[PDB]
Design a binder for this molecule. Sequence first.
Ligand code: HEM
Length: 162
Amino acid sequence: PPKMNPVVEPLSWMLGTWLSDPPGAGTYPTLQPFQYLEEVHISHVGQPMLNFSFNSFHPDTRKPMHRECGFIRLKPDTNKVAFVSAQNTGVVEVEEGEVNGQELCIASHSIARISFAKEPHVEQITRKFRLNSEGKLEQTVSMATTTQPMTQHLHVTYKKVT
Ligand code: HEM
């Protein structure tokens, strides 16, 4: 209901409640391929930023899996974007980059974790968000871990439900 702060207009295409369709696709050189369901809620309350919650679930049992939440800020009147996330693995990250048209490309510069986080530890993350020609939201996530160089981990497209 609050009018949207002009600072976040360059990312207005991300706003909504979204559901992975088809299921998200998970991979890594060390992992068997997997699928997952994900609910994405991207919202705002009038501040110069977006609020997000991304919650994934097992496609069959619907048991909760990865979860994260945070904020997406922009430098006013620019296309420069900064993303902060806390993840249920006990990991936090700061990613920055830019939006051009309806594509956002960001990369981590800072990652920290809890002392008992499960190994292997992630060292670098990059994400690409885009709105495709059908009006669906796409996210692709890549990462490097202590033992694996930068490569794709996740790809998902979402249907807006709300
Ligand atoms: C930016 C967000 C994420 C990061 C940084 C991240 C990081 C990682 C890392 C470091 C690993 C271990 C890699 C290895 O075993 O070599 C992993 C594994 C895994 N992740 Fe992700 N992850 C993310 C998002 C997700 C999401 C959304 C899902 C959806 C369910 C997911 C599901 C899994 C699964 C199933 C595994 C392997 C579990 C196993 O070892 O059996 N992750 N992730």
